[PDB]
Design a protein around this ligand. Structure first.
Ligand SMILES: [Ca+2]
Length: 223
């Protein structure tokens, strides 16, 4: 997250870290046994880390649970990042409490102008690299589809939305991928892609979760 603020420990209780020996992507806990993330975060050997703030220090509220099954969206296209969403089943159910909690799926899509909370452990610089140990937060609005398509001609599908600031300076970034965009208490987006981080006229692009709720529910019901 570039241009954000330190969330505070366990104030984003649905945020997870995906770990394969190191943090590599975020995700969101959507019930006690399932996480949603970005398909471009797929790999084998995932351990899901819940209840994290500092990802390098054991602080006392963590739950570390390995994945038993990953399901990348059937129509994921790694060249265009269309349908950049996957589901991860945990080997055992998490213990839910005030600091480890699920986030609700949306019943409707959020409109442009809605303010959302984006969070993650990704790079905090637009030029260069600096990776934080603690969770960073950013409040940002959903942008109109016209402004999103004007920023990224030929690249925005119906399964994507833009959020952020056209002036630059505030954005998600590398390492935030897969993490949540929460608006009015619902998961509306997944950190997916962008050109660089926090550049002028290049806002973040997010998977539009409201388009996937039927697939998510059906998949969980059968796996
Ligand atoms: Ca920790």
């Amino acid at each position: 997250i570039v241009g954000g603020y330190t969330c505070g420990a366990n104030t984003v209780p649905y945020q997870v870290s995906l770990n394969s020996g190191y943090h590599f992507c975020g995700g969101s806990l959507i019930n006690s046994q399932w996480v949603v993330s970005a398909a471009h975060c797929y790999k084998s050997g995932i351990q899901v880390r819940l209840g994290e703030d500092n990802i390098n220090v054991v602080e006392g509220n963590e739950q570390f649970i390995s994945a038993s099954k990953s399901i990348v969206h059937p129509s994921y296209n790694s060249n265009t990042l269309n349908n950049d969403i996957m589901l991860i089943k945990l080997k055992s159910a998490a213990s839910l409490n005030s600091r480890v909690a699920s986030i609700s799926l949306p019943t409707s899509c959020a409109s442009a102008g809605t303010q959302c909370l984006i969070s993650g452990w990704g790079n905090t610089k637009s030029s260069g690299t600096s990776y934080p140990d603690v969770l960073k937060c950013l409040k940002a609005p959903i942008l109109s589809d016209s402004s999103c398509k004007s920023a990224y001609p030929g690249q925005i599908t119906s399964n994507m939305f833009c959020a952020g600031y056209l002036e630059g300076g505030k954005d998600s970034c590398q390492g935030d991928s897969g993490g949540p965009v929460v608006c009015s208490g619902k998961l509306q987006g997944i950190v997916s892609w962008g050109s660089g981080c926090a550049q002028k006229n290049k806002p973040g692009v997010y998977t539009k979760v409201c388009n996937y709720v039927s697939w998510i529910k059906q998949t969980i019901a059968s796996n």
